[PDB]
Design an enzyme around this catalytic site. Structure first.
Site, PDB file in Angstrom:
ATOM      1  N   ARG A  39       9.596   6.747  -4.385  1.00 20.98           N
ATOM      2  CA  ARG A  39      11.057   6.966  -4.144  1.00 20.98           C
ATOM      3  C   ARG A  39      11.683   6.316  -5.445  1.00 20.98           C
ATOM      4  O   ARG A  39      12.978   5.791  -5.620  1.00 20.98           O
ATOM      5  CB  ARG A  39      11.589   6.411  -3.465  1.00 20.98           C
ATOM      6  N   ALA A  90       0.657  -1.136  -0.550  1.00 23.21           N
ATOM      7  CA  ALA A  90       0.096   0.624   0.095  1.00 23.21           C
ATOM      8  C   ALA A  90       1.291   1.311   0.059  1.00 23.21           C
ATOM      9  O   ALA A  90       0.074   2.428  -0.255  1.00 23.21           O
ATOM     10  CB  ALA A  90      -0.541   0.185   0.992  1.00 23.21           C
TER      11      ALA A  90
END
Ligand SMILES: [Cl-]
Ligand SMILES: [Cl-]
Ligand SMILES: [Cl-]
Lengths: 451, 451, 451
Positions: free
Chosen positions: A15, A10
């Site tokens: 990044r 989730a």
């Protein structure tokens, strides 16, 4: 008793700088979450509850298990919140193991130990001892027994000295989890519901928390960026390479070896530097694979030698074949016992017979070639007429002279000798020397061009 | 004085999971035992006594030295027992150096130092100081001098603190060894005859044991499985790569470089990533080798550039040749000064003349090609008639047009211009433009097929 | 204010065993001194004073900057002496930064910090803290401030405990440097003029020396042999690979990846093992590059897949092209959207149209090929007549049958179908099925040769 798994998938994964949901990025050729899914099914999970917050289209496109249950986390409020979404599906009488779609290397062996260590009415917890446990929540123990998790921000000078930290992976009964999850609150700085609150709940209720540890730290490593993924890739390949070496496959350089799938191997296989094995590869006894080969979903019989820089996909070699260097075998390539394929040769949906050789600069597509055939250099099966594929059939003991063209559909008889440079359009009966040639003319006095 | 060597090659090697005797597995392309055999002959061994217990057929097939003496150990009763089998062959007046077929990296330099340090009537012993000496037998010393070896099982709490351990390699006089070996007994847990008992014998008799150490720990590393072999491979390649770099060969990535044999090199050679050099390779000054080349038993003159992914075996390039990328030179390939071979080109027993070019998609086999020739793309020498090989001869300053076939035996004169697509069967005299062609016909109204 | 740079390139470099001046040896495909030159120009140096002692012919051949000033050090008398040669060119009102042609990885970031830290009338000094500072000159500090450099030979037992050492890189005002350099003497064992004497001069005059440190130790590593160069290469590639991974390029094995130049990349690029990127490479979104490719000065549009072992130089792929495995694209190669190039195919100054395929064993040189063309296997554009290159033009929706030869200059119309094995010399009008073929003859009773 029965058991089900929750896989948390989730995170936002920002990044990763990716349009692909993070847990779908691959490790050894398989999506990270698929590693976890496979472990859970190896454990015999009755259901796999996949909790996601984003990318549900792409997840559902990629993952298909008959027991996969999709659970939307509508908002990113913490792992405890994520479990509350799966909680309505837990059975009271089953254990619920909690896993992470971005911790791919967790092993069945470790999880089986975790499951055995869960006390009745209590919690099994997967903890790891780190050389530097900074940032991680510390496991507290009084007279041997676990009592709680202290986050690093709230740890004392002496607390920050515990090297045993919480990995987030845990197991507990379905009905107990439903009880704890319902009591979760979110009065804290982040406003999140932290799954670790249930440790204190169990302890305050009088139940036990028993911890076990992974065999390898890599089993509980998480991936938030592609540097972490690549480092985990190397760790995993290294472990696979050691197992293969110890089992008796010679890898000339285990650091330059990649297996993305599975390998069945015989005795005395030798694999040289920079080989990539993908999908399901089967190698017979005493197979030699040269520098740089890529072999995917293929079966290579006893004693074959694959010379450097060959690419093999969905191919079948019988025993004692030689291909390469610079061979390109495509799906349906099929070599019978003792056949040879040389350099700059390509086969696709093509069978080369027992002891038959195509040594140079040849394309064989959609062809059945007999036994003891010599496919001369430069030969091409023209299997494509712009719209449909056609089949070329060559019999036993045929000499196809260098630079011949076969215009499929054409059948060639046994013992045929086709001359060099000739173009074959109609069939050829047995032992017919066939040719299509113009005699060379010698021009006198031609002046070669100039700049 | 004279000296002979015993190589112990008597382990079962079960952990190799191999049908090949363990000491025959290769390191840098040479069998482990052959490394030891070569060191012993470099030392000038009068005889090499190879003590084996299994696999004598395969050993004798693979090892051939005029001074190799085969000694069967009929039963696996320990290294001391193995020496008792060789003992009837020792001369009284020669030194006997004891080596191990599975410790391949022991160096001549170290062994020469060991030999110098053997006291008369005594024993030279090769010992190494380990960071963790657990399991190994410790060297005991009183007032500087060696006195015995204490196995780890029988070491005291304070004894297990010695970091100097026995490597098993030793040297002593022939007549003394015969004396000690005869006194060996086998009253112990394993029922074996341990060679290290002779250390105590020499000490109790009043003789000295002097120890020396290897330069590198890798020199005394043993191989019992293929993981240990692969690790030793990397160590050895790394050491070779450093020597080459310091001697002035530029390796772009020394970790991606393999030498399996020998290299003579000129000044200013550059070798790119993932190059394998096998056999005896000779490189001139300023040779550039591209990523991925494999070069075996070949000589490459000054200033050649080998582009990426070329495979060269038993070839000769003169100065200033360019081959590749994707060149395949086979035994007898021979390029004269300034010749060029392009991509997807194969040469076998073939000479390409001074400044001649075969740039694309060409097979040249059994051919002598003159100077300043342009072998067009797609050209093939048909040297094989199904039974015998035939020779193609092309003169000086010949233009062979793209996709020509030469049906050997054929001679082509000087200044010949052969047209494109033409098939050459009979000879061609000087300056004859030769051609064999049908003019193109233009069909009106042809409908191309459909699915 | 203004600033100029002195690059010292005056060592003999004997330990390189090279005919090429040491600072010209490359790192990541660019000469070491060029790295330093580029940093200085990034800093905005008004002039770059290159001080050399040997190899001026080769240096001047290789380095060309409009602001490069060549300064001969006629004799090897030390870095202080080398600065005295550049000193007549310093302006009083500019800073002079002193750099080393063999310390290539010094970063603009570090140098900008050094420049900011130079006190007026004083010296900015670049120092580094080493785990083992043996041999290096130690920075002395009293109550926080720098006061001098003590060489290791002259350091006390307690002095040799400073881990902060002088890197040799420094910055100071032009007029101050002229003052200090003139006061340099050479009364010492080596008879050299040591630049570090100016530190004591500044201190004794009442001025400050302020030190800063590099971010990474590699920034101040020097190269005296090719082992040091190769180690610096690996360090640099590793750092580049980490940046790419963190920025969102997936490198399957960052240790087997080389960038020798620059990379612009889109989202979700995947690069497999052993890829070399050279020059200026531009990759679109979701480009996949397979094991072993070498790509130099090329632009590869969105969604292309480059299969293993392709070599690309100066090429242009539009979006959604597939090339390889074993594709060789040379300068002027140009693929339009959705075009395909297969194995053992070579393009040079050639454009393949929108959705056109050349899948096997083909050379396309000096050609413009239309849209929806099928270049059959074995096709060759004969663009070379021995003296000049000629152009082959193929229209839209052309089927070129396997093993066709086009003898440039030839134009082929739209909708043309060229038969297999045929030779094309004159133009072809639209929709003409063109062919040049002899029907196959069937010889009865031919006996195939025997050994
Ligand atoms: Cl190989
Ligand atoms: Cl390269
Ligand atoms: Cl791949």
């Amino acid at each position: 008793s029965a058991m089900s798994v929750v896989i948390l998938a989730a995170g936002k994964g920002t990044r990763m700088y990716s349009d692909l949901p993070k847990v779908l990025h691959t490790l050894a050729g398989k999506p990270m979450v698929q590693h976890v899914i496979d472990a859970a099914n190896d454990l015999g999970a009755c259901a796999v509850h996949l909790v996601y917050g984003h990318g549900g289209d792409l997840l559902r496109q990629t993952l298909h298990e008959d027991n996969l249950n999709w659970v939307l986390q509508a908002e990113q409020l913490g792992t405890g919140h994520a479990m509350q979404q799966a909680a309505p599906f837990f059975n009271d009488d089953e254990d619920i193991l909690m896993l992470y779609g971005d911790v791919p290397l967790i092993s069945v062996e470790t999880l089986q130990r975790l499951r055995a260590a869960k006390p009745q009415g209590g919690i099994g917890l997967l903890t790891v001892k780190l050389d530097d446990p900074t940032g991680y929540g510390r496991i507290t123990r009084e007279n041997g027994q676990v009592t709680g998790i202290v986050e690093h921000k709230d740890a004392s000078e002496a607390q920050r000295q515990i090297q045993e930290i919480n990995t987030g992976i845990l197991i507990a009964g379905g009905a107990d989890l439903k009880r704890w999850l319902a009591k979760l609150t979110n009065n804290n700085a982040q406003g999140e519901y932290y799954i670790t609150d249930i440790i204190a709940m169990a302890h305050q209720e009088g139940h036990q928390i028993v911890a076990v540890h992974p065999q390898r730290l890599s089993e509980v490593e998480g991936v938030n960026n592609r540097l972490q993924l690549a480092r985990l890739e190397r760790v995993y390949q290294a472990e696979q390479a050691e197992k293969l070496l110890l089992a008796g496959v010679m890898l000339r350089d285990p650091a330059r070896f990649d297996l993305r799938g599975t390998l069945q191997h015989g005795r005395d296989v030798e694999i040289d530097t920079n080989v990539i094995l993908e999908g399901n590869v089967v190698l017979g006894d005493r197979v030699k694979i040269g520098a740089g080969c890529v072999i995917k979903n293929s079966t290579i019989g006893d004693d074959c030698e694959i010379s450097p820089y060959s690419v093999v996909e969905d191919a079948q070699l019988q025993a004692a074949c030689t291909i390469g260097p610079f061979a390109r075998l495509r799906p349906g390539a099929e070599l019978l016992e003792g056949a040879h394929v040389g350099n700059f040769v390509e086969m696709k949906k093509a069978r080369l017979g027992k002891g038959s050789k195509a040594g140079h600069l040849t394309y064989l597509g959609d062809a059945e070639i007999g036994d003891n055939v010599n496919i001369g250099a430069g030969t091409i099966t023209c299997n494509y007429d712009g719209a449909n594929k056609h089949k070329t059939i060559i019999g036993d003991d045929v000499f196809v002279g260098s630079d011949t063209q076969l215009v499929a559909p054409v059948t060639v008889g046994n013992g045929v000798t086709i001359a060099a440079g000739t173009t074959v359009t109609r069939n050829i009966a047995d032992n017919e020397l066939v040719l299509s040639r113009v005699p060379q003319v010698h021009k006198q006095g031609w002046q070669r061009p100039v700049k």
